[PDB]
């Protein structure tokens, strides 16, 4: 049943507004987001710190490549935005490194 390609409908809740974009499922959702021309945090682009986090709104996404949050923080809706890729349309707030 499954499409051998795709991408999903990106929703993110940043400071300066919503945007929305398209995101192949084998793009992560930082780099399809800086391809449209979003300006979003970043440092370590490895999975490993808490720069490019967000919270996860509405949607699955794929975090296999990110190390940094744990498992508790996953179930709680964490993201890290340089690590994830979307496995349907979601809705990601962006810029919640604060938070941790
Ligand atoms: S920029 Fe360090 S985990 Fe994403």
């Known amino acids: 049943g499954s499409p051998e390609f795709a991408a999903y409908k990106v929703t993110l809740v940043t400071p300066t507004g919503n945007?929305?974009?398209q995101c192949p499922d084998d793009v992560y959702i930082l780099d399809a987001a800086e391809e449209e021309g979003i300006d979003l945090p970043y440092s370590c682009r490895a999975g490993s710190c808490?720069?490019?986090?967000?919270?996860?709104?509405?949607?699955?996404?794929?975090?296999?490549?990110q190390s940094f949050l744990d498992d508790d923080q996953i179930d709680e809706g964490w993201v890290l935005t340089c690590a994830a890729?979307?496995?349907s349309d979601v809705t990601i707030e962006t810029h919640k490194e604060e938070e941790l």
């Open 85 to 87: 890729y979307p496995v």
């Open 50 to 65: 808490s720069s490019c986090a967000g919270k996860l709104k509405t949607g699955s996404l794929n975090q296999d490549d």
């Open 19 to 21: 945007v929305e974009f």
